[PDB]
Amino acid sequence: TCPFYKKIPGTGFTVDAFQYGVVEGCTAYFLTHFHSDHYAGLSKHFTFPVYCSEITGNLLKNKLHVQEQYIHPLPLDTECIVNGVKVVLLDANHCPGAVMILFYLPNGTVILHTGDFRADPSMERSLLADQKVHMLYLDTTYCSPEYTFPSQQEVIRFAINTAFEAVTLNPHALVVCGTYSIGKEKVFLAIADVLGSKVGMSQEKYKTLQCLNIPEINSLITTDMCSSLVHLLPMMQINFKGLQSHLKKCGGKYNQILAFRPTGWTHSNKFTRIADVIPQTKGNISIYGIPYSEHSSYLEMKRFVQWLKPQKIIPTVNVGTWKSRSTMEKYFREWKLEAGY
Numbered sequence: 001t002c003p004f005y006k007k008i009p010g011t012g013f014t015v016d017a018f019q020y021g022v023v024e025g026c027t028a029y030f031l032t033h034f035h036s037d038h039y040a041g042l043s044k045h046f047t048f049p050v051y052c053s054e055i056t057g058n059l060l061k062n063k064l065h066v067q068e069q070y071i072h073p074l075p076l077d078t079e080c081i082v083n084g085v086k087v088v089l090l091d092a093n094h095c096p097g098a099v100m101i102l103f104y105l106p107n108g109t110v111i112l113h114t115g116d117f118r119a120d121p122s123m124e125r126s127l128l129a130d131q132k133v134h135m136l137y138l139d140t141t142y143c144s145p146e147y148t149f150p151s152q153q154e155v156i157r158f159a160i161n162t163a164f165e166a167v168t169l170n171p172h173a174l175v176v177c178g179t180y181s182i183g184k185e186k187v188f189l190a191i192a193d194v195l196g197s198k199v200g201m202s203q204e205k206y207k208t209l210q211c212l213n214i215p216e217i218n219s220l221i222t223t224d225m226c227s228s229l230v231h232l233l234p235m236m237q238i239n240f241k242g243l244q245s246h247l248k249k250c251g252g253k254y255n256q257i258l259a260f261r262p263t264g265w266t267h268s269n270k271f272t273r274i275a276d277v278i279p280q281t282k283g284n285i286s287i288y289g290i291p292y293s294e295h296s297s298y299l300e301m302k303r304f305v306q307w308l309k310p311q312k313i314i315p316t317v318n319v320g321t322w323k324s325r326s327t328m329e330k331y332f333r334e335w336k337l338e339a340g341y
């Protein structure tokens with residue numbers, strides 16, 4: 001059955017609720033972003049209205065084959081009316097096409113659903129700033145003070161500098177980047193840009209990236225693996241066996257692999273700095289795990305919530321255990337008291 005935290009009170013709406021069959025009294029289904037835990041259940045046989053961003057709509061049509069007559073894309077930062085309720089889609093700073101949703105209830109209640117997000121001070125100057133928000137449905141993935149990570153900018157500088165050094169020392173080294181979903185495209189695009197190369201990948205991945213409205217994408221990506229010295233592979237293949245196998249398939253064009261896994265967090269963050277990250281190495285293969293997050297750190301989340309000052313907070317992640325629920329509630333109370341309420 002559909003959990004309470006995917007239901008929007010006083011409306012016919014659900015959010016990211018496609019795996020529960022037909023939901024009782026749901027007149028419109030919202031999808032915040034194209035990640036499988038959120039879209040699970042959608043297909044060509046879905047015949048209810050789906051509301052989403054333009055990019056999410058492109059992916060629904062082309063990857064899942066949802067019929068166009070049931071896809072309702074909305075522009076960002078624009079007041080729209082859906083089944084008689086005013087809504088706004090805001091950029092979530094997660095993966096391409098990911099949104100937060102503002103709902104203005106007929107009775108005057110205002111609700112923000114963050115979907116998945118990485119909180120940023122730039123959000124403090126969107127349409128959020130223009131009215132009080134009463135209820136917040138919050139992405140609490142990393143809601144604990146141990147979750148510190150660097151900026152995306154610092155992590156990308158590290159990856160660019162590491163790749164440029166390696167390939168300048170050895171022109172016969174291949175760079176490989178792991179992927180298993182949309183998001184974190186900057187990792188492989190910034191590396192390819194510093195090496196003067198296109199990124200090579202499967203036909204299926206190339207199709208996915210063509211759905212994203214990235215400027216000048218025909219200029220950065222390719223299915224011609226032979227022309228490219230940055231290759232994308234499934235995340236499952238980023239290990240010594242998988243990479244040894246790939247190197248054999250390149251026909252003696254390359255004699256070394258430098259590979260990146262762009263993981264969310266790793267307990268190395270609790271001890272170590274970004275400058276101090278080191279690879280796992282075996283023979284002519286090195287694997288770097290880099291802390292590229294598309295979710296809020298604890299401090300970023302805290303700042304957003306103390307700025308917004310909602311009346312009620314409803315977590316949407318880590319809700320399955322009493323210990324996690326209790327821990328999150330205690331942090332919310334701390335944040336409230338520190339702000340003076």
Ligand SMILES: CC(=O)Nc1ccc(Nc2ccccc2)cc1
Pocket residue numbers: 305306307309310311312313314329332333335336339341
């Ligand atoms: C679980 C639940 O609903 N509790 C709750 C709700 C709202 C706040 N709001 C707040 C936070 C920081 C600063 C000013 C207000 C804090 C805790």
Ligand code: NI
Pocket residue numbers: 033035094116
């Ligand atoms: Ni996500």
